[PDB]
Design a protein around this nucleic acid. Structure first.
Lengths: 200, 81, 108, 94, 96, 200, 94, 102, 81, 96, 200, 200
DNA sequence: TCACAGGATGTATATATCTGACACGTGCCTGGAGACTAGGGAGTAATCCCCTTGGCGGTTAAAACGCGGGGGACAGCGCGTACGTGCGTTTAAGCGGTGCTAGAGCTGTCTACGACCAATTGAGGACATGCCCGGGCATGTT
DNA sequence: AACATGCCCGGGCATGTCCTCAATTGGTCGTAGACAGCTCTAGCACCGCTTAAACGCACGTACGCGCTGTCCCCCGCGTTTTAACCGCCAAGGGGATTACTCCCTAGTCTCCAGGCACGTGTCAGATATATACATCCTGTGA
């Protein structure tokens, strides 16, 4: 169905200097997740681990939370709600925390919460923020994307943006970033193809 | 009318050939000459009569003969034209 | 009113310019005919006419006659190499022919 | 009477201006008439075709001037051209 | 007695008939030949003496001209006599 | 049927500096939508997305609305109401928001309204105006045109002008612009043809 | 640019009537255009003189018919005349 | 129109040509009709003979050579065109008997 | 330029004579042929040029040649006209 | 070895060249000959290739036609070989 | 809509030797109706006179009738009812005898009847049979076809067969024939094209 | 789900000499439907017309019916019910006659019936049998296949056999035939590929 | 066997007799120049595109050059038939009227068609506008 | 990495409409043709007389046709050299096309003299007859 509104996608580093980072994975065939700085785009396999780093210039208050949401990149599709396709919605792959229809999951975190927004009808996944561990300048969240971008009756090949928001206890906005996502069978091949088209 | 082609006498054929510088003759010439003359004369007549019929006359005039001749590359002076 | 002077008189020609302009400008030859054209042609005809008559008159005196006859015109035309092209195929009444006898026919 | 223009007048006048003490027999005169008409038809015919070929409306001294060269041998052509030039030159000048 | 050698008269006749201007075919014969030919195309056709003379003079001219060319062909074959072949050759050369 | 009046097509930027803009699409034979600045003309496929940008020198009040209406360009036909043809008027292709017979639709927007004017008999589609996102410079509306210009019994090959009006909450005229529209199966081929004929 | 007159269309159509399966080279088509224009000029030129001599005011089927008989050999003339006669006859009835 | 006379050749063209070329002041409308029929008839005679000539050489197409042969193989046309030259016509394969070996 | 009459070469003269069915060609023919061909060319060109000059062109076209040929009693097809 | 006793080739050439349509003269030299003559009447004349083609076909046609008649004259003299005087005769008969 | 059945299209000359014939029309521009024996196909313009001849070896009884019906030629479309397109169905071109929606009409005959068959939903037009006029071997009926084959929402570029049935006063079959029909702007152009393709 | 049984696939011409036939369509890349005699296999696009001919040596009684059913060709999967995938099951493409979940439909025929077998859980589509006209040798039924073989959650790339059975008005078995079916985007490409593998 | 002188025949020049050429005068009939106005042709200037003219390199055929033998051609000789020439006789042509009818030639009057001009509708080719399948890319399994 | 398999834009083809030129239809006015009538000339037909030409028969030489021998032109084949032919590129001039302006021509009007046609008279040419010059035939010379 259609939403009454479109989430803002503008980058906003805020008081804490918020930003996103990603692992230096290669473009090999067998790669499960890889990121392109040139495209600001993540390429990943369905249900595989997708590390996203959170970077800040100063530590946010306790009770700060991190939310991930998907929207279609093309402006005419922006009001449609991104969701899993009917096949993957019916199949028995829920982890006991995520609703069957949600596209984005967070793995390894018991404090995760999944929202189907009563006003906008948007799906999103939220976790608490935690400051970086010893020997890292950043905090890493492991996402899983539960449909390929190509799934018919789902995203149906339309590109999506993952929007990441840093938020306070009430859900007010502390910072925002976004990156394009492709969920596909061969991330290394597809990343190289799109980076090559950048010269064409 | 018939046989007036014989009217073209053998000496007359001599005289014509004499004017053309001809000195000595084979009798075959007489019959061949009459053939050639007939063809030439017949073609001229046929044209002249055709003009006459076009004008819807009964009588051929010199002008019809002049035109009949002329077109075959035979401009004739002295009869009009 | 200015008293009439004929175009033949203006051009200094004997042949009648007005007639010629009529023979050009009507009787299916042309769309338009300019005034100099008849004059030019009349002179040409006059010149050629004179050439034939001049040659023929000599032939007439070579035959001690004061009156030109068809024979003389024939002789003139065939003795002049250029006329013999211009009128090459013409036939002339009572013209006769030139006294041409081939050398191989002569007695010896 | 029914009318037929002939050149006999002018033909004899030209003779008188060449061999004053001579005359023309009626048959020689008939010939000169056909001669004039023949040369007249040719030049008029050729001048007509020149204008046609060049897709243009007026017969002028030039078309005749050209026709004369095509019809006449060179020697006659040049004399004739000279005369035709003078007659027109004088006529326009007078 | 006298008696010309076979084939001398010609040179007189040649000059006489080259020199003179009268017609060489007789009037009545030629006239009837014209009518005899013309009737085949149209009966009751009628004539002008000027027209008949005009035909005659063209025919004599045609034959005389033909004979001269015929004569040259015979000379070219180095013969004294003209033959039908000489006529045919000359005509064929003129595309007749 | 015939209208009692002709809508004014005169450009009027008004107090807010209202102007239109369009995307830099190529001239590919069967491109979905493409615009010609040289002709001030849009070339688009039937029912496909037609992005129109709204540009302003200052932001209009809240409650402002944007209306689109079609008129025939040729003066003789200006009094006729531009509508869909009998075939596309009967076809079952309504989206649950637009009336069957309206030529112009807006996609994506749940707050759209469709007017059949009781006085002029004209058809028009309206949405609330929205300002650009912070860091953007214009607002994009996505129109769909629901008949080819060639439809017999409808536009019947007659060119149309889309008139865009900026309006207050009551329909009062705040600003006006217009562009010529061709709805056709092969927009890029047709666009190139018209731009070449501009040199002839 | 400029545009041209020729008979190539009609020549092509006639060829189909005599030989439906046979094509024609552009060069042969060139010949045929000269042939048509030549025969046209002869007939028109002759018919012109027939009218001139008889001092008549016009070219009619008659002058053409006569001219055809003067230009063509007899056999071709017969057939040509028959066709011309039918054409004028039919055209008059049509 | 041509469909009136049943002709393929265009009468009105012929009519305009007859009005020009300085042939005459005036025309009787049967004239171009009659002339068109004649030109068409002669055209057919040549093309028909030419197609046969093309078939003898086993070609589906007429070339100037075939017109040349076809014309000369009908002495009526040979006479009518007895002064014409045909571009790339070639000539007839006539050898005089006196030249052959014996 | 010059000496292009020598450009009408001997075997080319022979080939023409082969079209004429000629079986044997004497040594003197080639000169005589060249002379004849020159006269024919001179007459045709002179007339063609005259047509071109009359039109005040510098360029001789096929039509100029076709006309120059026509009036010499010879019509050419296949070059226009 | 083998070599022809003469003339069978000549008959073959007659066959071939009578069969074939193309130019038998050289393609370029004739064009220069046209310039060389034309300049005598006027300098700086310019030549359409089509015009020069027309001249070629006319000249070949003229010479071929002349050779036909030349051949007949030679046959009439019952000679195997053609001679200048054969050409001269055929021309003079044709009124050149 | 669809039909419960397909009319038989088989050629059946019956007791009377029934056959069809057509005029020897050319292939020129503006030709109203032209028939191809090679294709067994009639090419005609919208609303123009289409003469169809009826041939018989012996005369049927008085009260015999002649019926024309259109079916789609392609076997998967045979069950759809052939009818006019929505535009031509609405336009004011009824002659006072034909219903607005019927594809085939008969002109010049006051005894024409139009049937919308209650059981099969098929349209057809019927007239009395008449024997040939004195000196004629056949009887001519003038049909009109009231939509182009290309009309969208109508025949929509699908070929149709016209079926002609000779039948008694109760509608029982006496004889049957059929021919393909194309209704188009240029029957001569199209007929030549389809006949030329027969050699390719 | 899994069926309690596997339908018999054995060919049985029966009392009426029943056989199947197929059109001589080529292998143009995107040909809508094409058949391989070498593989006894049909290659066709989703929802497109699949003409199957019915051949008989004598006409079956009135009230005879023709039924089509699908089974998986691999013995490991023969007990699974061939059905549409969850996406195509939910989408709004029912023609007003077929249930949403059925793989096989018959187009054009108003007298079609769809059975979901209470005992075997097998889907099938049925129509009345119709004889050909006396000089035509076979009757053509036009099937549609409503999922690609590759549909995930449905056929999931597993090959299927279509089983065709002739029945009386009570459903007793009068004859049976079968053929393999691949439902795919490029039937001509795929047919050539599998026939080339027959030489490998 | 080949060419010139005297006589005869053909062509040119003079005298006698008769006809035609040529010269001079009067009345009739346009034909011709002088004159004026307006659509048009022709002329002059400007601009753009294609062809002609000019240049260079490589490869093949044409042509040029040389020798030998066959046939053609030329020269000379012999025999028979046909043509040419002379004389005499008969018929036709030419010449010179005599008579009659049709056609040609010319004039007048009336009708139809042609020519010329405008408007309306069709012929022909080019363009205006949409759907399929193919090509190729997009995206997944082994 | 290669093969498995779905989806969108492009080339082409499918199919409806426009613009430019030709044909058709109608009207108006003038000229030519068509049709009829009348007059005179020429043609056609017929008869008589005289001379030349043609026809027929007889007689002789040259020309034509046929045959043989001798010498040089030509053809045929091989080898070597030069330009033709072919392929590709560049610049300038000419020809073609379009617009604008003036003067030749055409068309229509008026008036006077010359030419044309017919009539009248004398001188020199034309023809016929007779004499001299040029060419041919017969006889004579080399």
């Amino acid at each position: 169905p259609l939403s009454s509104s479109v989430p803002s996608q503008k980058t906003y580093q805020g008081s804490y200097g918020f930003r996103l980072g990603f692992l230096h994975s290669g473009t090999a065939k067998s790669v499960t997740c890889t990121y392109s700085p040139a495209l600001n785009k993540m390429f990943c396999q369905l249900a595989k681990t997708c590390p996203v780093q959170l970077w800040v210039d100063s530590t946010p208050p306790p009770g700060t939370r991190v939310r991930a949401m998907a929207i279609y990149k093309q402006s005419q599709h922006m009001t449609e709600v991104v969701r899993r396709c009917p096949h993957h919605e019916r199949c028995s792959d829920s982890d006991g925390l995520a609703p069957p229809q949600h596209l984005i999951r967070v793995e390894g975190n018991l404090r995760v919460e999944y929202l189907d927004d009563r006003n906008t009808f948007r799906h999103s996944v939220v976790v608490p923020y935690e400051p970086p561990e010893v020997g890292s300048d950043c905090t890493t969240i492991h996402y899983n994307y539960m449909c390929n971008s190509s799934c018919m009756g789902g995203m149906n090949r339309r590109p999506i943006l993952t929007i990441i928001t840093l938020e306070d206890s009430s859900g007010n906005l502390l910072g925002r970033n976004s990156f394009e996502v492709r969920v596909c069978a061969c991330p290394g091949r597809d990343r190289r193809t799109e980076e090559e088209n950048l010269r064409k | 009318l018939r046989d007036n082609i014989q009217g073209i006498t053998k000496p007359a054929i001599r005289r014509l050939a004499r004017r053309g510088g001809v000195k000595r003759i084979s009798g075959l010439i007489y019959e061949e000459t009459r053939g050639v003359l007939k063809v030439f004369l017949e073609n001229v007549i046929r044209d002249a009569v055709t003009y006459t019929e076009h004008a819807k006359r009964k009588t051929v005039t010199a002008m019809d003969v002049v035109y009949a001749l002329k077109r075959q590359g035979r401009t004739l002076y002295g009869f009009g034209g | 009113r200015a008293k009439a002077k004929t175009r033949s008189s203006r051009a200094g020609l004997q042949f009648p310019v007005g007639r010629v302009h009529r023979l050009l400008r009507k009787g299916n030859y042309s769309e338009r005919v300019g005034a100099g054209a008849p004059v030019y042609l009349a002179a040409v005809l006059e010149y050629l006419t004179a050439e034939i008559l001049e040659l023929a008159g000599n032939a007439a005196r070579d035959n001690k006659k004061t009156r030109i006859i068809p024979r003389h015109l024939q002789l003139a035309i065939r003795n002049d190499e250029e006329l013999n092209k211009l009128l090459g195929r013409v036939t002339i009444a009572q013209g006769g022919v030139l006294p041409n006898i081939q050398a191989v026919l002569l007695p010896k | 009477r029914s009318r037929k223009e002939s050149y006999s007048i002018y033909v004899y006048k030209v003779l008188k201006q060449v061999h004053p003490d001579t005359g023309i027999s009626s048959k020689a005169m008939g010939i000169m008439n056909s001669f004039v008409n023949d040369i007249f038809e040719r030049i008029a015919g050729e001048a007509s075709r020149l204008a046609h070929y060049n897709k243009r409306s007026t017969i002028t001294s030039r078309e005749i001037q050209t026709a004369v060269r095509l019809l006449l041998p060179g020697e006659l052509a040049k004399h004739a051209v000279s005369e035709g030039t003078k007659a027109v030159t004088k006529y326009t000048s007078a | 007695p006298h008696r010309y050698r076979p084939g001398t008269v010609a040179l007189r006749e040649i000059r006489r008939y080259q020199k003179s201007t009268e017609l060489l075919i007789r009037k009545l014969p030629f006239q009837r030949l014209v009518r005899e030919i013309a009737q085949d195309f149209k009966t009751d056709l009628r004539f002008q003496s000027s027209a008949v003379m005009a035909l005659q003079e063209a025919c004599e001219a045609y034959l005389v001209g033909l004979f001269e060319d015929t004569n040259l062909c015979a000379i070219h074959a180095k013969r004294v006599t003209i033959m039908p072949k000489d006529i045919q050759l000359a005509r064929r050369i003129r595309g007749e």
